[PDB]
Design an enzyme around this catalytic site. Structure first.
Site, mmCIF file in Angstrom:
data_model
loop_
_atom_site.group_PDB
_atom_site.id
_atom_site.type_symbol
_atom_site.label_atom_id
_atom_site.label_comp_id
_atom_site.label_asym_id
_atom_site.label_seq_id
_atom_site.Cartn_x
_atom_site.Cartn_y
_atom_site.Cartn_z
ATOM 1 N N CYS A 1 71.499 -51.999 90.433
ATOM 2 C CA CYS A 1 71.739 -50.832 90.591
ATOM 3 C C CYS A 1 73.083 -50.703 91.417
ATOM 4 O O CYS A 1 73.616 -49.474 91.377
ATOM 5 C CB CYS A 1 70.707 -49.823 91.200
ATOM 6 N N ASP B 1 66.458 -50.222 83.527
ATOM 7 C CA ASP B 1 66.836 -51.516 84.485
ATOM 8 C C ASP B 1 65.858 -51.806 85.240
ATOM 9 O O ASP B 1 65.920 -53.186 85.861
ATOM 10 C CB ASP B 1 68.237 -51.450 84.657
ATOM 11 N N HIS C 1 64.556 -45.488 85.229
ATOM 12 C CA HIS C 1 65.532 -46.311 84.360
ATOM 13 C C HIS C 1 64.851 -47.481 83.659
ATOM 14 O O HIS C 1 64.143 -48.168 84.543
ATOM 15 C CB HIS C 1 66.574 -46.679 85.498
#
Ligand SMILES: [Ca+2]
Ligand SMILES: [Ca+2]
Ligand SMILES: [Ca+2]
Ligand SMILES: [Ca+2]
Ligand SMILES: [Ca+2]
Ligand SMILES: [Ca+2]
Ligand SMILES: [Ca+2]
Ligand SMILES: [Ca+2]
Ligand SMILES: [Ca+2]
Ligand SMILES: [Ca+2]
Lengths: 636, 636
Positions: free
Chosen positions: A618, A446, A444
């Site tokens: 998350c 992020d 991801h």
């Protein structure tokens, strides 16, 4: 359009003239012989123009009729053409006209009031239409637009207004009829209601409808909703047409006399970056995470946010609130509403978007195959957006969506599902950029970037994870006496390691050089596609290690994976080496962020999240304020 | 792209620099302390630039490296950074560089030779790619591109050339590897072959391929074909990418170092209007039509055309050669070839396009459902194109496709199938226009319009059927003595009628007023969408009558439905009233056309075609010369 009326001395002609239309005259086709010239005389409500007094009877000469006002009765305006010649007494051809007003109207200036083509930008035109994908109906769990009924009056506020405005003689609709239609191609994408109480006149079942309209002055209100977002097979325009038919001859078919249209564009789903003021925060409660939940609760309260929590009965143990959804919005002059994009991930939090987020003034949309064919790269910790930027002239006033991909496709590469990609691109207004994230085990974007407000420059900073910076910091400490300091100070059930052994571990150093490299590649990619300079970027000290399939994970809690609630950051607690009373990681971060007016709070997520391969970002999600800039004013 | 190299006194750095790339230096991250300034010295093949002698060691100062030529060996170019200060002896950081050339090349200037984005117009860029939809293979009945092999050398002429041009040290590919790829999204639309003999490297089965490349100077040729035309789900771009991977560390995953792309646009299917010089003509032979066939044979021979006939064994009695297909072309700098668009009509002539037209240098394409869900409006007598025109500034240098539709959709309206419509629109370059034809029993725009070359004005005339003009002519004859003259003079098995009874028949006159009206509506529609003036238009005298479902048919042979072979027209024989030795219909037509240099031949099609609801145009088809103007030079 424009009509051509043919005149004859043989007998008089009768025609309808819609106001706003160009009406022309053919004088020569049936001009009688003997004849060399003509004159025109008309009643006071008709304006006559003649280019290329009396005139030679020559086909190139142009005659135009314009009507000033609607007729009170059939044939109340007259035109008389006089043909004459050298020794020829005048002969007259008559034209009896009926003027009417037919105006189909919509908010084409995008100002929330009402009274061609669709064009982008601040000098453009064309009305907007929202997908009716919320659930104002307090009863069922369907989007409002899935049925053929308006079940609340509140539902109408989501709809766009279109008004048909007619002015005719009282008996005009004895012999004419109005039909409202949409192409078959687009009928499965719009629904139109007549207001009388509301009744469906166009939709997936019906592409045309005979309207019931009284002679005289009348105004009829329609309410329009969209049922589909722009997508690869739908550019996002919907055209609705009104046609006037002559039904005078009972033996013959109806004959089109006039058509007009309005063109709607369907509003795109739009994301909000971390630099937009927060409004509501989301998380799970699970086994032993009350402590994580209080730090978040505190930080919300400080940032003035509603908070919302998903209890473990609904969770099914799924803690990753980030991954199952993304909260965006849709926006029209008359109505703005948040809308949740629900990832086809479909793990424990599968029902949360459907039941708990979607509702009154909260929209819903989803994509991709729901029961399989997925990857981790379809989780929405792999979906982000930049702040507004301008790249070599071109403005992206809503930012650019960013999502992670592999560098090229192989038997072992992953990608976000094509349907998701195609959806994001079809929204147009945040022109997505593909980044390289498949080198991470979870994969991801992020996990290596984040954005934060800044008071200066362009209004933000990009934060990137940086092994380089963590080596430099640790080296500096060893140099200054603290080689003995212990990483993971504060954690039992865990093997501490000293700065000297971290610095001298060559495998670890190799793994982080490979990671530095995957991240430097995105650094440049972001620099090119967001027009960033180095002074837009701040490196966060962060180590990684490689594991199964040589995929990267965080060596200590991944600090870049933080919750950004305005100036209040919820940063994962690194548990660094404690030197002069403080973790040097926290101190280093604080020294890079606090001069931007940011407040750093370090939340402990270690046994709850981190050892499960994710951090604070998350575990949470945020709804944020829509841009003030209006998407239709962009020129993508 | 652009790379950032970080230098350290700690140890020397090793990097690869692709020629044409911007390489920058980070001097400050690891600049040692004591230190206040720097100097750079480099070997002769490196150019060094410095904006914002020796320099202050300040992060805002910019350092760029450029390499002049490819390296002969690993690390043969060096950069030495010297850090120094007030009382500090210089310390040196070393950078060893290897320069290489990687160029992926294609005909981006559209000139048939080889050595970013795709842009339209004469000042634009990007290579073209043809769909390989002919059958150069003299064996099977498959399009060349349906398999994974190049079975003829001639097949290669249809393909686009791409060359990879490398210059490296001799051992460079010990530690680096090149991969060629295409996105998964686009792999089902292209096939790429390596020339060695040709072997498939990318395609529907394979989205990436490791290339086998020797160190030193090398050139590798690829051949590319497209497998799909632009369509609603395919905008027509295909991107192919080359990536250079570092494979130096046997423990770690490969690391991307450099990517470059070329972008191809797939050539659209393009039609040719009647004003384009003919080259080949088509017809059926059936029961009793030898006479029709000889008049056509004559006219072909006069227009210098190949002729081609479909015997009745292949026909299955289907005489309408017009309706089952339309002959267009595709066009690239290196290759132009005709391509047949095969209508899903699928009547007797169903096999003719597959077996008889498709072949060496003759392309094939089809759309719509093949075994049902069709209408008459899907027959290609309902598909035409205008000559080139300019409409209020905007050029349509290839014309505009025209096809018939209903005025609005109802339970009783017909339309051309959406897949056909969507295909035509996705070709972009002839921006289709919808006309109104559903008022005709058969429903084809060829029943009321045609186009013909003209020596002046814009180079053509639009011809429209016109009851008005047939009434005027007949009236004039009655006025001048010939009210007794008989329509259908020359036809037994048929009831003749006199001009006086035709003029006085009020039902007939009503039916033709309704038709005049459907046609006037298209007249204006064509005027707006093709920017025509009245002096572009010529009316052909033509009567109609209404029949089943009040749909229009031709009262006598429909003269506008003619075969146009340059200046040689094959016009249906009206069998008009014979006055002063000639049919006045023929005489009237000849008087409108012969001053444009047109030769009118009247072909008798009465019992063969006309009583079957079609004429000469409906019985035939024509391949014509592609435009000289290059489609990619348009800006749609
Ligand atoms: Ca509803
Ligand atoms: Ca609603
Ligand atoms: Ca889901
Ligand atoms: Ca609502
Ligand atoms: Ca996200
Ligand atoms: Ca082949
Ligand atoms: Ca071929
Ligand atoms: Ca067919
Ligand atoms: Ca060929
Ligand atoms: Ca045709």
């Amino acid at each position: 359009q424009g009509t051509l009326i043919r005149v004859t001395p043989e007998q008089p002609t009768h025609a309808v003239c819609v106001l706003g239309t160009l009406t022309q005259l053919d004088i020569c086709s049936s001009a009688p012989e003997d004849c060399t010239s003509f004159s025109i005389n008309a009643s006071p409500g008709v304006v006559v123009d003649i280019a290329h007094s009396t005139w030679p009877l020559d086909p190139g000469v142009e005659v135009t009729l314009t009507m000033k006002a609607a007729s009170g009765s059939t044939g109340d305006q007259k035109v008389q053409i006089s043909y004459y010649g050298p020794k020829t007494p005048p002969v007259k051809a008559l034209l009896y006209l009926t003027a009417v007003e037919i105006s189909l109207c919509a908010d084409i200036t995008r100002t929330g009031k009402v009274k061609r083509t669709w064009t982008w930008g601040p000098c453009g035109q064309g009305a907007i239409l929202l997908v009716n994908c919320d659930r104002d109906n307090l009863e069922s769990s369907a989007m409002d637009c899935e049925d053929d009924e308006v079940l609340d009056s509140e539902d109408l506020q989501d709809m766009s207004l279109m008004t048909l405005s007619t002015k005719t003689p009282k008996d005009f609709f004895t012999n004419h009829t109005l039909v409202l239609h949409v192409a078959r191609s687009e009928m499965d994408k719009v629904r139109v209601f007549q207001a009388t109480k509301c009744s469906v006149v166009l939709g997936p079942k019906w592409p045309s409808h005979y309207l019931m309209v009284p002679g005289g002055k009348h105004n009829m209100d329609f309410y329009v909703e969209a049922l589909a977002f722009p997508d690869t097979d739908f550019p996002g325009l919907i055209t609705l047409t009104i046609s006037l038919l002559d039904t005078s001859n009972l033996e013959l078919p109806e004959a089109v006399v006039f058509q007009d249209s309005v063109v709607f564009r369907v509003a795109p789903w739009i994301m909000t970056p971390n630099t937009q003021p927060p409004q509501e925060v989301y998380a799970c409660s699970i086994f032993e995470n009350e402590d994580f939940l209080k730090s978040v609760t505190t930080l919300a309260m400080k940032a003035k946010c509603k908070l919302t929590i998903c209890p473990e009965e609904e969770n099914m143990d799924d803690q990753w609130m980030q991954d199952e959804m993304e909260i965006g919005y849709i926006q029209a002059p008359h109505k703005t509403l948040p809308v949740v994009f629900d990832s086809p991930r479909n793990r424990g939090l599968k029902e949360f978007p459907i039941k708990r987020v979607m509702g009154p003034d909260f929209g819903y949309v989803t994509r991709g195959p729901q029961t399989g064919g997925i990857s981790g790269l379809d989780s929405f910790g792999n979906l982000e957006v930049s702040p507004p930027v301008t790249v070599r002239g071109k403005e992206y006033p809503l930012g650019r969506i960013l999502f992670g991909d592999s560098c090229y496709p192989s038997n072992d590469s992953r990608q976000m599902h094509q349907a998701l990609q195609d959806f994001l691109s079809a929204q147009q207004v945040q022109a997505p950029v593909k980044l390289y994230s498949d080198w991470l085990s979870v994969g991801h974007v992020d996990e290596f970037l984040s954005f934060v407000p800044a008071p200066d420059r362009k209004g933000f900073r990009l934060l990137l994870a940086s092994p380089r910076s963590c080596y430099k910091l640790f080296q500096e400490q060893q140099n200054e006496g603290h080689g003995e300091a212990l990483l993971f100070e504060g954690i039992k059930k865990k093997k501490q390691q000293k700065i000297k052994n971290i610095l001298s571990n060559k495998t670890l150093r190799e793994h982080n050089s490979f990671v530095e490299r995957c991240i430097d590649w995105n650094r440049e990619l972001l620099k090119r596609e967001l027009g960033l300079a180095e002074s837009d970027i701040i490196d966060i000290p962060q180590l990684f290690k490689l594991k199964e399939f040589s995929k990267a994970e965080a060596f200590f809690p991944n600090m870049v994976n933080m919750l950004v609630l305005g100036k209040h950051l919820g940063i994962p607690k690194p548990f660094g080496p404690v030197i002069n009373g403080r973790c040097c990681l926290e101190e280093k971060v604080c020294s890079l962020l606090e001069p931007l007016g940011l407040q750093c709070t370090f939340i402990n997520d270690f046994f709850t999240y981190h050892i499960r391969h994710g951090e604070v970002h998350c575990g949470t999600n945020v709804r944020r304020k829509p841009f003030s800039f209006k998407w239709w004013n962009m020129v993508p």
